[PDB]
Amino acid sequence: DVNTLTRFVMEEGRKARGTGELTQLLNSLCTAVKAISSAVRKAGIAHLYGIAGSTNVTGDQVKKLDVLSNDLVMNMLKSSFATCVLVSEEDKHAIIVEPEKRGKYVVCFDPLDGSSIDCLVSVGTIFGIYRKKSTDEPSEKDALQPGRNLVAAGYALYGSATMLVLAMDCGVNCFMLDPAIGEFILVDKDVKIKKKGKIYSLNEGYAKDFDPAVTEYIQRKKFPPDNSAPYGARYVGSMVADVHRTLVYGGIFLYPANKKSPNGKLRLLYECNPMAYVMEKAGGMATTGKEAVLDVIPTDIHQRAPVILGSPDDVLEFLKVYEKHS
Amino acid sequence: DVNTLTRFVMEEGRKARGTGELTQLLNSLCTAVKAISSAVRKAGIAHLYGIAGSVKKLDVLSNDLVMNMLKSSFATCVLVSEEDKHAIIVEPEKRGKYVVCFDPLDGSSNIDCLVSVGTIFGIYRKKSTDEPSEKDALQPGRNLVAAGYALYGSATMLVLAMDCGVNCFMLDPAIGEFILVDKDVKIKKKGKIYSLNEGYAKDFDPAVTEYIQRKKFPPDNSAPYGARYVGSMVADVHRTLVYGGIFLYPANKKSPNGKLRLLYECNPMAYVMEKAGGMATTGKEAVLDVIPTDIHQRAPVILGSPDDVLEFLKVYEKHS
Amino acid sequence: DVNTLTRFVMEEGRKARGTGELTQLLNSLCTAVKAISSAVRKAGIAHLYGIAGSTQVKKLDVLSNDLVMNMLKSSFATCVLVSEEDKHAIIVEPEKRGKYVVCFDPLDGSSNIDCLVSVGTIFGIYRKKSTDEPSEKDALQPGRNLVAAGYALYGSATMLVLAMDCGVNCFMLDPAIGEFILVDKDVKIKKKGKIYSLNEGYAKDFDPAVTEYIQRKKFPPDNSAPYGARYVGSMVADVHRTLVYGGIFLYPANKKSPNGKLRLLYECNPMAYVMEKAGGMATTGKEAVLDVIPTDIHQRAPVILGSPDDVLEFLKVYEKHS
Amino acid sequence: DVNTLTRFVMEEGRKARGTGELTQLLNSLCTAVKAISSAVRKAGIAHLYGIAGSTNVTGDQVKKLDVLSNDLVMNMLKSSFATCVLVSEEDKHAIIVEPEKRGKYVVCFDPLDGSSNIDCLVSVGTIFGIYRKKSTDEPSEKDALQPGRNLVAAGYALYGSATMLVLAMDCGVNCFMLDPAIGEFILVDKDVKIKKKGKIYSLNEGYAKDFDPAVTEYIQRKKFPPDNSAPYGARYVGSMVADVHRTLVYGGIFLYPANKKSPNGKLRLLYECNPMAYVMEKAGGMATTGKEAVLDVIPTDIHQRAPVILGSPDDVLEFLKVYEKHS
Ligand SMILES: Nc1ncnc2c1ncn2[C@@H]1O[C@H](COP(=O)(O)O)[C@@H](O)[C@H]1O
Ligand SMILES: Nc1ncnc2c1ncn2[C@@H]1O[C@H](COP(=O)(O)O)[C@@H](O)[C@H]1O
Ligand SMILES: Nc1ncnc2c1ncn2[C@@H]1O[C@H](COP(=O)(O)O)[C@@H](O)[C@H]1O
Ligand SMILES: Nc1ncnc2c1ncn2[C@@H]1O[C@H](COP(=O)(O)O)[C@@H](O)[C@H]1O
Ligand SMILES: O=C1NS(=O)(=O)c2ccccc21
Ligand SMILES: *C(=O)NCc1ccccc1
C-alpha cells in the first residue's frame, strides 16, 4: 500500500494515543519543508529577473533563501499551536512563543544549512524536537536538553530530489517529495546503516590543523595496514548531503575537534544532535571523540560540538585511534 | 531586460546568419533537459509506489530523452552517448549536419543518495561529404561549436558555451523556462578550493601528491585551500566555475589513462572552462587538443582557474 | 494565521474527540484530489506524445477513479465505496475495513473534457448505519445522514470545498507546494442571486413550472432587471458559481429524463448538503433532496438548488402548477 | 515525432524564409502564456496568505491577476524587439514601443478576462492578433486599425482544466497542450477543421428581453426545430475563449449579436472578435456581424465593439437566413 508522510505521521500518532499536538507540529514542519523546497528549486525566479517588468517582485521573492527558510519554519511552527520555545541558527536568543499559541514542544532547527548555494550545492533543513520538562514559564533553558531526550529528529535534503528523513522511537523512515502532487511518499522504511562502509568524509584541506588521531585515522583509510582496498573520499561540504550519503551508503563523516577548534565547528543543538539521533536510530554511532553526541548536556544554545558519525565499525575504529592518542 | 534560453539561442542564431538548424538542435536539447530535470526531481514517483493501485531507470530514460529529441530535431547525424557501445547513426530522413556527444545523466551511480547529477554535451559540425559514421565523432575538442551541461542540483541550471562566451540559465519550474541569470561568465583567476578523490592517494603520480601537499601546506604561508569533492563531475566542475579553484581526475591504478571520458565528459567541460578564461589540461597537453581514436576513450583532466592549473603544470613539469 | 486543509481537518478531528479514522479518510481524499488535479492539468502529457521515443478523456476518468478508490481503501477508514464509474458498489476487503461509506464521482470528463473548460470531483461520506455485512445497502442512506461532503473544481485553479457540521470551507490548491490553503471560511450563500443556470436546450421538454419560472427570470413581471444566464454543463462548475455569486441551478426532470438526469448518491446529495450548510436550499420540487430515501445506488433525481429566495420562488411556481 | 510549439514555430519560420523576427515574437508570447498559466493556477498563493509570516490579501485578486497578465504580455512583447504598437484590452491608449526595441509587428490582445467574466474560476483565457505595420509613419494607434483580413497570426490560450494554446496562421489552425511538468506546449491537434454543422448553441439568454427579433427566432428554432429534429443543446460559460474553443472542438454556433440597445454588440473587434474570426475562418468556419464578415470591418477606434456570430458554416449560414428574413 502507498503511504504518505501525512498518513504515516497521523497513524503513528493514533498508535501512540497522543492528543494530536505532535502530529500537528510535524504536519506544519512538512508544509514548511515543501515551501522551502519550492523556493530552493527557484520557482518564480523569472519574476526576480523582470519577466513582468520591474514592479512585480514581492517581498518574499527578494529575501535570501536562508532568511525565507527561517521565516517559513518559524511561522509554520508557531501557527501549529504545538511549540513553546524555538531555537534557530538565525537568531542569537531562543524564540519564546506567544502565550496564545503555546504547545509543549521545543524545536531546534537549522532552516537551510549549506546556503553559504550559489554553486547549487545540495542544501537542507535539520530539526530536533523535545518535550518541555520545566514547570516554569518557557525559556531558553528548555532547549538545553541532551540529545537523548529527543522525541523526534531528522532532516530534509534538497538534492537531486527532495527527501525528508524522520527519526523517532519507531526507527528511521525516508520520504520522497513528489512535486507533481506535493506529497512525501514513503520509499524506505525502518532504514539501518551498514555495519561498515568504504567512504570517509571530511575537509582534508585543513590537514595542517588536524588532531594527530584524525591524521592517523585518515592515513589508515588511504593506506590500509592490512592491504585492504583504500576507502573512497567524498565531501560535499553541506552536512545534510554528506550525512545522508553516509546513511545510504555507509562509512564515516567527521567534523572533529582540533587545537584551534577545541569544540569543533558544527552546532550541537540543531546540527549535531539531530544527525546523531538519526544515526543511532539507524544502528549507527555519533561521537565527539570523548562521549556520545547525544549525552552532551549543553549550556549554550549555540555551542559547538565535534562530531564523528556513521557506520558503527568505522566510528569504533576511529575511537580506537583516538584512545591510543589520548 | 529579461531573457530566456529560447530567445537567447534564437538571437545568436540570427546574428550568425545560420539556417536555423543548430538553433533547432539547441531548442530540442533544452526540452530534453527540462524533461530530465522533472524526472530527476521525482515528479510522478507516487505512481511507482502504488498511489493509483498499480518504469525505466533514470539514466536510461535520460538517454532516451536526449536521443529522441536530438533525432527529431532533424539537425544531427551522429550521436555518441555513454550508454551505447557504438555511435548511433541518425536515419537518412532525419539527418542534419551536427555530431553530438553527450552524457545523459552523469553521476547517476550514486543517485541513490540524492547527490547532484547532470547532463553533459558537446556539439560538432560534420566535416565529410561522406556518409556519417562513428569516425565523424573523432574530432579534437578544439572543433566544438557548442558545449555545456545541465546541473540538477539544489536548482537546475544550464550552462551553455559557444564562441560568444559562457552563459548560465536557471530553470524556473513554475513556468518551465530557462532564465538567463549570468552573462558572459569568466572564472576567477585563482581560487581557494581543490577538488579530487584523495582516496586514490596511494596510486597518485608524484606530481599530484606534491601539488596537493602545496594546497594543504602552502610554501608562501598563505592559508590552506579548502577541499570539496561531491563525486559527480557536473557538480564539482560547476562549483569550480562559480567559486574558482581546481578540479582533478588524474590517472591511477584502476584508471591509468584517467577515468573520465574524453568525448562527452572531458571535452565539454574543457570547452566551458576555456571560454570562461580557465584552463583544462591532461598534464601533457590541452584536453581540447587531444585527437581521439576511440569514442569511449578516457583522459586525465585537471581544470579550473588559470593560476591554479598553471601551478599544477609547474609541479608536473618538475617531475616530467 | 495561514491554514491548510491538513491542519484544518486535523484540528476539527481533535475538537470532535474522534479516533482519527475520519481524519485519515479526509487526508487520503485530499491526496487523491491533488493527484487528479495534476493529471487533469496534463502533467507528463509529453511522454504520451513520444518525447522519449516510440516505446484520452475516458482514461483520465478511469485514472481518477483508481486514485480515489486506492487512497480510500488504503485509508483503512472505509467499508463500502460507490463510484459513478462502477456499476456495483465496491466492498472493501475485510482487513482494510473502517466505518465509513463514501459515494463519489471521481471525474466528469466523459462529456466535455475535450473542450477543457472544467471537470470536478464530488464526494459524500456516511457512517455505516447497519451492523450487517457491508453491502450496497449501506450506501442507500438519505443525504440528511451525511457526515461530510464536498467537491474539487479543476478550473482556472483547483479548489476544494468541504462541508461538515461546522459549515462550509473553501481551500485553494497551491501547486508550488501541493497544499490546499484555506481562502474562504464558513461560507454562506447570498439570500438572493441574479444568475440562473440550466440547459435551455431542453425547453421543448420542460414541465410548465420550469417554463414559467425561467420566463420570470428573463421577463420579470415587476420589470426588475433580468437575471443573467450561465451554463457550463459540468455540475461542479455550475454549482460552485451558484455558491460563490448566488442564484439558482436547475437540472429538473424533463419528458425524456422523467426521474431527472443527475445522480442522487454522488451528485445531488453532496451538492444539496453543501448548499444547506451554506444557508441555501436544494429541492427535487416535491421534497428536499437530502430527504429522498434512495433505493438504487445509481438512481437519478431532479434538483433545483441555490439561494433560498430563488429556490423558494421556484417552489411557489411549482406549487401553482401542482 | 513529438512536436513542441517552440519547434513548430521555428520550423514554420524557416519554411517562410523570414528573418526570425516573427519567430521571436511568438517565442516571447509563448513564454508570457506559460507565466500567465502559472499565476492563474495560483502557484505561490500560500505566500499571499501568510505561510512565511506575511499576508497581503488586499484589493481584488482577480483584478490584480488581469494586470499581472497584461504586464507579462507587455514586457515579453516589448523585449522581443519584434513589436512597435501594442493594443491591450487593459489599456486606454495604444502602447508605443520605445524606439530601440521596435520591430515590425502590431499586436492586439486581451491578456486575461478574469474581471470581465463571472466564471473566472471556471476558465479564463488570453486572446491575441498579430499584424504587420503597413505604413512607414511614426508608430501610432492607427497602425492597429487594420481589418482582420490583414492578420498574420492569431489565436488564444485557454486556462481551463488544462492549458491549451491555439495558433492560427496561413498554414492552418494548430492546438498545443501545455505540459506543466516541463513547460512545453505539445502539439496535440494538427490543421484542425470545424464540423460543417453542430448541435450546440452558445449565448447569454438572459438578454432575451433585448434580443433582436432575428436572434429570438433563430434560438427558438434551435429549441423547437421546425422539422422536429433533435433540439440543440445549450452551453454558455461567459468567457469568450472557453465558449469559442468549445465551438471549434464540437461544432455549433456562438453568438454575441447586436440589438437596439447595443447596435455594435458588446465584444471588442480588435482583440476579441477579429482573432476568433480568424481562427474560425482558418478552420473552415464562419464569423459574421450579421451584415458582413468580421474580418472585413475596417476599425476606426482601437476599443470599438463588433457583433459576432461564429462557428460551423451551416449554422452561421442558417442564422444569416433568419437575420435576412428580418432585415
Ligand atoms: N504522530 C506521532 N508519531 C509518533 N509519536 C507520537 C505522535 N504523536 C504523539 N506521539 C507520542 O505521544 C506523545 C504525546 O503526544 P501529544 O499528546 O500529541 O503531545 C509524544 O510526545 C510522542 O511520544
Ligand atoms: N543559435 C546559434 N547560436 C550560436 N551560433 C549559431 C547558432 N545558429 C547557428 N550558429 C552558427 O552558424 C553555423 C551554421 O548554422 P546552421 O546553418 O544552423 O547549421 C553554426 O555552426 C554556428 O557556427
Ligand atoms: N477531522 C474531522 N473533522 C470533523 N469532524 C470529525 C473529524 N474527525 C471526526 N469527526 C467527528 O467525529 C466522529 C468520529 O470520528 P472517528 O472516530 O474518526 O470515526 C465523526 O463521524 C465526525 O462526526
Ligand atoms: N515562425 C513563423 N511561422 C509562420 N510564418 C512566419 C514565421 N516567421 C515568419 N513568417 C512569415 O514570414 C514573414 C516575415 O517574417 P519576419 O522576417 O520574421 O518578419 C512573416 O510576416 C510571416 O508571413
Ligand atoms: O490530452 C488531451 N485531453 S483532451 O481530451 O482534452 C484532448 C483534446 C485534444 C487533444 C489532446 C487532448
Ligand atoms: C475567479 O477567478 N473565481 C471566482 C469564481 C468564478 C466562477 C465560479 C466560482 C467562483
Ligand SMILES: [Mg+2]
Ligand atoms: Mg464520472
Ligand SMILES: [Mg+2]
Ligand atoms: Mg481583460
